Structure 1
Amino acid sequence: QESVKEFLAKAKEDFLKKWETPSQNTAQLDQFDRIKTLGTGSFGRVMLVKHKESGNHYAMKILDKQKVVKLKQIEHTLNEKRILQAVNFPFLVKLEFSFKDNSNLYMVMEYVAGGEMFSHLRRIGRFSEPHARFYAAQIVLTFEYLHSLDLIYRDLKPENLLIDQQGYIQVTDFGFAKRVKGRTWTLCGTPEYLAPEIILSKGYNKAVDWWALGVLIYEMAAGYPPFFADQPIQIYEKIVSGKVRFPSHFSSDLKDLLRNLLQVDLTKRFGNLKNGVNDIKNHKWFATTDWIAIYQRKVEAPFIPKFKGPGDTSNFDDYEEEEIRVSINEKCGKEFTEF
């Protein structure tokens, strides 16, 4: 709490500015060669693109102006830009450019090849307590950083946790994020990581985040996640009851952390407590972990992926290809003047 407070404040400012002044138009579609579709969205597509000049692949999220309105996702779609545009941190995915064209919007991040976590996890089976720790140590620092900027994250999961050439992580998709102060009431995110506040809908807060950190971990360490059924409503009652079963192989300090996070009471849940993050940051489980090396990305990674070369999409899925349409007249240029 010496060096780890000069930052946060130093870091809260840097951000503020950007926050409060976002470059917009920074490129045009043509500067890029569309290579391949990476991930999806009900309001866009994330695909692989090669920058003409600098043979640098990036990754282009492209939301269609007309699909984001039917879901008013505007309010949102605008801060994801404003955030990535101001947010700044190692474990955060870099935004390089943002432009819009007649029809749909574009955010162009750095390309994290290694592939999304959710998959290695399913491939491998589960993670070894350390392995999981390696990651967690990265979320904790991450949410420490964020939370300090009045930014709940709202959408933590393995599909958002991408893996770089050095097994470290970068979280993508700030599409649910929200700079706030106090309570907010939006029901957003996968039913599986839903803190039980959200479920009743009684204005949650950053606390819902730390809760997802547990679900994160549990699952990282078990494969399966704590709460899970077939159909959503079911998973719902499950969560509120809060009866969690630990697999036999859980370390003891694993099972400790957990039930502190997976705490159906905010007013008694690490992350929400008066000692703040230091409750977690100090939990035995993190005994060995050196909070700087990680940070400083000086630590040697447990895992890795093999990249055949620059812009290798092996670690990724195969989706159906589509075009990048651009009707002839500025469709929906009203609501997106900020973009």
Structure 2
Amino acid sequence: GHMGNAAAAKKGSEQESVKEFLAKAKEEFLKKWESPTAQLDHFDRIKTLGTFGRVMLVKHKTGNHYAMKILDKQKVVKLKQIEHTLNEKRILQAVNFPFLVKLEFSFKDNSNLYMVMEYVPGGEMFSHLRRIGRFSEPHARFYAAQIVLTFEYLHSLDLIYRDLKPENLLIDQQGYIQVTDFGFAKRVKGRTWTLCGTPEYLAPEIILSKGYNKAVDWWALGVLIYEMAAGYPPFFADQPIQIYEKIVSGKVRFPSHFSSDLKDLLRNLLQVDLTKRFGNLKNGVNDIKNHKWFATTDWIAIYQRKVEAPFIPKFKGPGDTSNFDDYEEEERVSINEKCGKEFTEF
């Protein structure tokens, strides 16, 4: 067969150790989920890092920098995101993984909800990808491996993520990925039905109004790996409806510089037939982790953050924001409480 005796025994033991790690991780998650912080004047507001509202760099007045997310309650209501948003705070307080951004404080006032997270200073993968143009296959693989491990973790907790895209992946000071934005994350032991996500990254079963499951995240991983290695996504067009036509068609074309191993992996991730899509089969995530394109990946070394990253962003000190774009800076909290009943639990 493909593996000799030593190799097969090593892989077997590695897979059983993953099961052991995940069982403990699910126990910690459920304990925190069952039994889950500050105020606006505790922080000096510095500048706006990104755009329901804005994310701002703040300095806690222990001197540490954080990214403070500000959500207008009326906006959350108008976009019908009330349950998605209360759930995002609950998920972020309860999970724990090296590639998931860490929530440190939460609170609210008359008009806004606030989530204070660790500041990830290296900027969005999106910016780096558009600037460099495309990532080499080893560079794309280093990032992909972190997403594989992160989805393996989240899916073991029965959480579907549903918003993978380079815009939602931050690069930290060591060049590793931080997943942000859990507004669409949900516990789904079986199926769920909400039409949500980003057009380029939607699995066909979402577009076709089906009940769907965590397999949509593995489709989205295929889209991400393709966009990282090509510089552009596998399905695009002027308007979303034409993008959906390409996604459901069952056809994908690849750049001539893609390796044969990469094309084979992507044809198995970007698989319209759910009975054939990697991540959705009897062997689960092992079909992905054991694929030839990942043969050089040391999964435990990635998890321990012992692999040298291909890209280390510029860090000129604490509070440096040079990796983020510039946005217009605004100041206001209403004298009356907005949407009090809808957000009582936040």
Select the residue among 3, 7, 11 that pairs with 2:25: 11
Deviation at 1:72, TM superposition (A): 2.4
Of residues 226, 234, 239 in structure 2, which corresponds to 1:231?
A: 239
Query: How does the TM-score come out when normalised to structure 1?
Result: 0.97
1:44 corresponds, among 53, 57, 73, to: 53
Shift of residue 47, structure 1, vs aligned partner: 1.1
Aligned equivalents of 1:261, 1:328: Cα separation in 2: 51
Question: What are the Cα deviations for residues 271-298 of structure 1, in whole angstroms up to 9, with x where unaligned?
Answer: 0011000000100001000001100000
TM-score (norm 2): 0.95
Offset of residue 326 of structure 1: 1.3
1:1-339 matches, within 5 Å, as 1-22=15-36, 26-40=37-51, 43-52=52-61, 54-323=62-331, 325-339=332-346
Matched residue pairs, number? 332
Moved more, 13-22 or 164-173: 13-22
User: Cα distance, 1:65 vs. partner?
Assistant: 1.2
3-state SS, counterpart of residue 59 of structure 1? strand
Q: CA deviation at 1:44?
A: 1.6
What SS does the corresponding residue of 2:338 show, helix, strand or coil? coil
Alignment partners' CA distance in 1, 2:336 and 2:240: 41
Moved more, 325-334 or 303-312: 325-334
Other structure's SS at 1:85 match = helix
- Find the aligned partners of 2:53 and 2:281 in 1 and give their Cα distance: 38
How far apart in 2 are the matches of 1:56 and 1:195? 40
Aligned-partner Cα distance in 2 for 1:97–1:114: 21
By how many angstroms is 1:147 displaced?
0.5
2:8 corresponds in structure 1 to: none
> Displacement, 1:21?
2.3
Q: Separation in 2 of the partners of 1:182 and 1:331?
A: 35
Find the aligned partners of 1:154 and 1:226 in 2 and give their Cα distance.
18
Q: Secondary structure at the match of 2:260?
A: coil
1:243 to partner: Cα distance: 1.0
Q: Deviation per CA, 1:197-222: give whole Å up to 9, x if none.
A: 10001011100000000100001001
Q: Secondary structure at the match of 2:330?
A: coil
Measure how far apart 1:331 and its partner are. Answer: 2.3
Q: Could you report, residue by residue, the CA deviation over 1:225-270 in whole angstroms, capped at 9, with x for unpaired residues?
A: 1000111110110100021111110111000100000000111100
TM-superposed deviation, 1:180: 1.4
Q: Tell me the alpha carbon deviations over residues 114-153 of structure 1, each in whole angstroms, 9 at most, x when there is no partner.
A: 0000010010110100000000000000000000011000
**In the TM superposition, what is the alpha-carbon distance from 1:329 to its structure 2 partner?**
2.8
Inter-partner Cα distance in structure 2 for 1:322 and 1:267: 50
Question: Could you tell me how far apart the structure 2 residues matched to 1:85 and 1:177 are?
Answer: 13
For the residue of structure 2 that corresponds to 1:243, the secondary structure is coil
SS of 1:105's partner is strand
Deviation at 1:13, TM superposition (A): 1.0
What displacement does 1:58 show? 0.3
Distance apart, 1:95 and its partner CA? 0.3
The 1-side partners of 2:145 and 2:198 are apart by 23
CA-CA distance at 1:330 after TM superposition: 2.4
SS at match of 2:275: helix
CA distance in 2, matches of 1:82, 1:21: 10
Give the C-alpha shift of residue 36 in structure 1: 0.8
Moved over 2 A (4+): none
CA distance in 2, matches of 1:9, 1:337: 33
Farther-moved stretch of structure 1 (183-192 vs 326-335): 326-335
Cα distance, 1:14 vs structure 2: 0.5
Q: Secondary structure at the match of 1:2?
A: helix
* Structure 1 residue 2: Cα displacement: 2.2
Residue 175 of structure 1 aligns to a residue whose secondary structure is coil
1:187 and 1:335 map into 2 onto residues whose CA distance is: 22
RMSD of aligned alpha carbons: 0.8
| Distance in 2 of aligned mates of 1:331 and 1:232 | 34
